[model samples]
Target: AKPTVFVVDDDMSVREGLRNLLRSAGFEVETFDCASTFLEHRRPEQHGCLVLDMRMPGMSGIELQEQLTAISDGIPIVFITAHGDIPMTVRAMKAGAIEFLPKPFEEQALLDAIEQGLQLNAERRQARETQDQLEQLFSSLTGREQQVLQLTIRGLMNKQIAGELGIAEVTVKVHRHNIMQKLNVRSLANLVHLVEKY
Candidate 1:
């Protein structure tokens, strides 16, 4: 599915302008007049970027950014504000905002930020999918195989692992063969590479 561009600005004019511009630029745009309203509309499963106004009457963009951070929801944010300050801009950027544009920003600049944000979101989603698949594969091993996997990936030889587990060297060799088979890895290097991210 195509990513959505969510616009949250307290000013009706700003919201309308962004919606029209983003839509014309071939984006699916959703507009909200306040931070809380945007939060209410947001969902975990949605893939998108957020165009956020830095200041609002009820919830400031910084506050809303914190809420998202607390949940580790890394939806890319492009910040726009008429009354931006150095300190606030630093705070937003330090907290992972994609871009901070003052009011009267060039149309192309905002569009560029949106494109980068959407691209970043897609990459993040892909990484999470890979991590989930790896987790599923890891969970398929039996308890003993899991133990063997841990020792083998730690660079232990079969004889050393056998000594540690009070088992015969041949048994350790059998476990190592099964571990490689079940994990679908042919070499210790590949096994280490696959499990390194854990």
Candidate 2:
């Protein structure tokens, strides 16, 4: 699916202009006249970046950014406003906004920021998919195998793990082999690294 660029501005003209700008640049565009309208569409499952008006009638851009930060990942924010201050730019940057663009801005700059935001969103979504896949693989392990995995990667030999678990050394060996196959890691170092995340 094509990534979207969500443009939210109270000024109808500016919102439409931004929408057209993104569309012409080969981006799918969604427009909202106010922050509330935008809030309804901001979903974690959506892939896009936000191009928001810094000063709105209500739910100012900074406030909206704060709300989105907790629930969303890598929805890069590029704030634009005709009337903006240095303090505002600093505040937005501190909250992870990728760009704070002043109005009457260069067309090329806006396009550049939008492209950067799109790339960031794509990278974030890819990372989330990877973590989810890893989690699914990790969840398939039996409880006993899970225990063996912990001790095996904790610098323990098969005999020591067997003694710790009160199991035969042969049983520990079986669990160790199974864990390597299940987790798809041949080295204890790599297995330990995998186990660290979960």
Candidate 3:
């Protein structure tokens, strides 16, 4: 899936200019007049960096960022603004903005910021893929295997687990071996780490 640059600004001229610049850079672009409009038009699974303005009429950029966080939207953002207030810049950066460029920022700087945002989005997407794969692997375990995994991760010995589950020690060992095989883990430490992450 190719990434897009979503430009949200109240100024029509600004949006139009950004669209041209982004298009020339071999990037796909989408323009919106306001933050609210951007939110409405955004697709749930769209991949992109948001080129957002801090001051808009209906919904401010920071407020939109807050809403996105509430919905767990992890799209990267590059904020371009005329005001560039210190408090807002600090807040946006703390909240995971890739870059905040004040109006009159150099063209190269804006492009560089967008490049960084795209790279971050790609990395996050890869991490999410891994997380999803891990989830599937965990889900593939049998009910008994799941029970064995939970107890094994709790630092229980095979003998103790066998007694707790009313099974023989040899049977408990077999279950433990099967659990490791199903989870593709060679060591208990790695198994514990994956279980906690899952």
Candidate 4:
């Protein structure tokens, strides 16, 4: 499916122009005149990049970005500004914006930014999925199983875990095996990597 681009600008002309450009470039496009309007209609499951005007009448782009961050929404934003400065650009970048484009930007530059934004959003979605899987696996373990899983990932042997938990080594091994199966992890190294990185 073609990737969608959400264009948010208070100016009607700018919004329409962006929609036209993106559509011509083979992207699915949606346009909103303000932040509140966009937020009201957008679905979290909709995969896209947001092409946002930095300064709007209300709930400016920066404020919208903060709102998303607060909710842990991973939408990628590419800010378009008519009067951007170094400080403003730095602040946006620090907040995980995909790109900052000054007004009168080349069409090619805008297209490139959109491409990068889409890629970043896709990666963020994958990372979130992996994290959710890890959390679900962690939640499924019993109290003792949780302890055993942590220790196993920490490189503790079955005997050491048994001593630490006052259990038999055979019981410790059983918990370890269950943890590996529950996590769908085939090796100790894979389990460690999943826990550490996910």
Relative to the true structure, how large is the alpha-carbon lDDT of every model? 0.86, 0.82, 0.86, 0.85
Worst 10 residues of 3 by lDDT: 83-92
Worst 10 residues of 2 by lDDT: 83-92
lDDT of 4 by residue, 15-120 (tens): 8888899888889899999998988887887788999997888899999988887877778898888973434646568777888888868889889999999999
Ranking of models by TM-score: 2, 1, 4, 3
The deviation in Å at residue 78 for candidate 1 is 0.6
Instruction: Name the regions of candidate 3 deviating beyond 4 angstroms.
Output: 84-89, 150-164, 168-198
Q: Per-residue lDDT tens digits of candidate 2, residues 2-80? A: 6998988888788788888888888888999888878886676888888888788889988888878756445789998
What are the models' TM-scores? 0.81, 0.83, 0.77, 0.79
The predicted structure with the larger lDDT, 2 or 3, is 3
Cα lDDT over the full model 2: 0.82
Flag the better candidate by TM-score, 1 or 3.
1
